[PDB]
Symmetry: C2
Subunit: 290 residues, 2 copies
């Protein structure tokens, strides 16, 4: 088993198109999240809407159609192939930043200004599982539009954006839908490690994810057999080669540490490299970090 031989600051966020700039633990270490991007088992099984490449993360593609009040998108996959409402929550790569307005910069798959900003609300017509969303735009997009989440803002005036939330994918979502399951803190002083990125959030501050995107592609590419209850990783300074801290990587595809009280992995340098050390039991005690 290996993990990417790449320093943390050269790893991409799996929920927004941005580069990780620190690790942290949640203020409430019992907080449960249910991110739909950045989800992949250690054996290489993608979960939720998680795609393989960093350039598929938080992107939308679809055909413009007429809706009672304006225009909307009939969604496709990002490669333009049809999106059929099935097991997944939405097309692969579809953004998972919940409970906020999205602003998505798209182009028609040119003369003049080719870009349209699609302003998308997560209200009643927001139905990504069924394959459609609505938008308003100050431009006039038509046809096959492909684009990327550019920024997010509050759903209503006075509200704040919480990028730790996920969307509601629609009324057509049932128990048969393949939503990635919650990530539960596994107990005994361990805390989930969140990888944070700067991103434009109006009235907000950083966007968390639970796996750097290159970890996802690594697991998919490798299809490695899981040979223990957790993978013990060391976070190594690539210049001095010193071991800076112990982490556990769990088969369901998330990472934990034991944060020192009043600290944690947010106090480690952000240029270290994770390195697989050994397979360990589920209750293997970690040395506290940070």
């Amino acid at each position: 088993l290996t993990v990417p031989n790449i320093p943390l600051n050269n790893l991409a966020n799996s929920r927004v198109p941005a580069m990780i700039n620190k690790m942290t633990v949640s203020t409430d270490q019992n907080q449960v999240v249910q991110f739909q991007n950045g989800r992949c088992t250690l054996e290489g099984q993608l979960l939720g809407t998680t795609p393989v490449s960093a350039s598929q993360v938080a992107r939308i593609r679809g055909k413009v159609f007429s809706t009672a009040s304006g225009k909307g998108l009939n969604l496709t996959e990002l490669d333009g192939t049809p999106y059929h409402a099935f097991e997944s929550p939405a097309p692969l790569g579809f953004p998972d930043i919940g409970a906020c307005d999205w602003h998505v910069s798209t182009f028609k798959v040119l003369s003049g200004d080719p870009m349209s900003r699609l302003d998308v609300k997560q209200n009643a017509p927001f139905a990504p599982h069924l394959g459609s969303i609505e938008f308003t735009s100050d431009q006039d997009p038509t046809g096959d539009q492909l684009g990327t989440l550019a920024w997010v803002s509050p759903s209503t005036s006075g509200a704040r954006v919480d990028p730790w939330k996920i969307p509601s994918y629609g009324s057509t979502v049932t128990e048969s839908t393949h939503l990635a399951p919650p990530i539960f803190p596994p107990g005994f002083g361990e805390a989930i490690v969140y990888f944070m990125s700067d991103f434009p959030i109006v009235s907000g501050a950083q966007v968390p994810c639970t796996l750097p995107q290159e970890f996802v592609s690594h697991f998919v590419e490798q299809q490695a057999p899981v040979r223990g209850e957790a993978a013990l990783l060391h976070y190594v300074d690539p210049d001095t080669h010193r071991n800076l801290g112990e982490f556990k990587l769990y088969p369901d595809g998330f990472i934990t540490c034991v944060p020192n009280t009043g600290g944690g992995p947010q106090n480690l340098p952000t240029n270290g490299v994770f390195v697989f050390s050994s397979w360990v039991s589920r209750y293997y005690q970690l040395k506290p970090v940070g």
Copy 2:
């Protein structure tokens, strides 16, 4: 120890010159065309060249501090993590776009307690003040960007009215003609009927012959080589492009130590005629001289 290439199908690989996903391969219409892309460049041993960064989310991005002159605005460039850019051995900060001889339109945000519209579109001309190697560029904008701006190339357009964008060109990174900008070297088609394989992505190019951008290595190939640091054990690495369901070899390709891929295209055709869901797989080390079976 042993060289491999990514077990990832073509359609799941990212472009190394724009933030986009590869949707086909092709060869150049002039098969003797020499290119000198500065992104997507990495040796098989894992040595990054030019401005090439490691992650797909560093590709064609710009960061810097806004400054004002008497006549206008510019960015004093930094690396993408905000640390200082020092002119030393590289054309520009890592990840800096390399689409030459055109206007750029770069969408940035202030890295700030945001209110209102946080985005600025920076319109950048590749004229005299375009001096990324020395660390600054000028821009105009219909918005009001200040401070530490970070963003991504959004689209490109002609330098002058009536001109076209040619995304096969690279910028002139220097302010004077004899400024050493430390470019990654040119890539020549290497003989034996071989043609360089270009990986194409859809991208908004206003007034280009097509709205596509070529690159010479998928971004995940670059990061793979950086991670592996594998020794080169022959003059070229023979690859097969394989159907991931039937495991059939759809064609032979050569991967060269300097970090590019070739094939021998059938006349009037080439890898543009292959399926786009195949996976490249290392087969063996072969002599520079190894004659490939034609494809497509």
